[PDB]
Amino acid sequence: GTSKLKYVLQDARFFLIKSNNHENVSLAKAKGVWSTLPVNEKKLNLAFRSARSVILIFSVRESGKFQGFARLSSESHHGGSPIHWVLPAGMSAKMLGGVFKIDWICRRELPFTKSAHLTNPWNEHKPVKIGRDGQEIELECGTQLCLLFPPDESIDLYQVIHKM
Numbered sequence: 001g002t003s004k005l006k007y008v009l010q011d012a013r014f015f016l017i018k019s020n021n022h023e024n025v026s027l028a029k030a031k032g033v034w035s036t037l038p039v040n041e042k043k044l045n046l047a048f049r050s051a052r053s054v055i056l057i058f059s060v061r062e063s064g065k066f067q068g069f070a071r072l073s074s075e076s077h078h079g080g081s082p083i084h085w086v087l088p089a090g091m092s093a094k095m096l097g098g099v100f101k102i103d104w105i106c107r108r109e110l111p112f113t114k115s116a117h118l119t120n121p122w123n124e125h126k127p128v129k130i131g132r133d134g135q136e137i138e139l140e141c142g143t144q145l146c147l148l149f150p151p152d153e154s155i156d157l158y159q160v161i162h163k164m
């Protein structure tokens with residue numbers, strides 16, 4: 001069902017997370033972590049303190065889909081086990097901010113064709129699939145986008161609820 005999911009999404013904030021490759025999203029799914037550049041790190045840290053849930057929605061560039069969405073369980077922290085990210089052409093490992101811990105809520109894909117009716121007021125009402133890495137998605141658009149994903153029966157939101 002969707003009731004616990006809607007409860008997790010109640011009054012949450014949403015952010016569009018864009019990755020250049022599937023490998024980083026796969027590491028994120030396996031290890032429950034995400035790392036980004038400081039300009040986004042700062043935004044995500046602010047949002048984590050401000051809202052009951054901060055939801056990251058992942059899309060791999062050029063894939064035409066979203067790959068799932070997760071909930072921030074921590075602010076960024078430095079000095080863990082180094083994560084073997086596949087870094088973009090210009091970027092090195094010292095250029096990243098800290099590591100966020102995330103709980104996946106859905107590891108299933110959603111094709112852009114299914115979200116074409118969803119516009120993001122915080123990006124000029126362009127379709128929600130359009131946006132830079134870190135773009136915030138307005139509450140109602142983000143909520144309906146998460147509800148479009150196929151249910152992930154591998155995930156039990158009982159555990160995530162207990163962290164809010």
Ligand SMILES: O=C(O)C[C@H]1CCCN1
Binds near residue numbers: 035
């Ligand atoms: O957020 C960024 O722009 C950088 C990438 C590196 C690992 C995953 N995020």
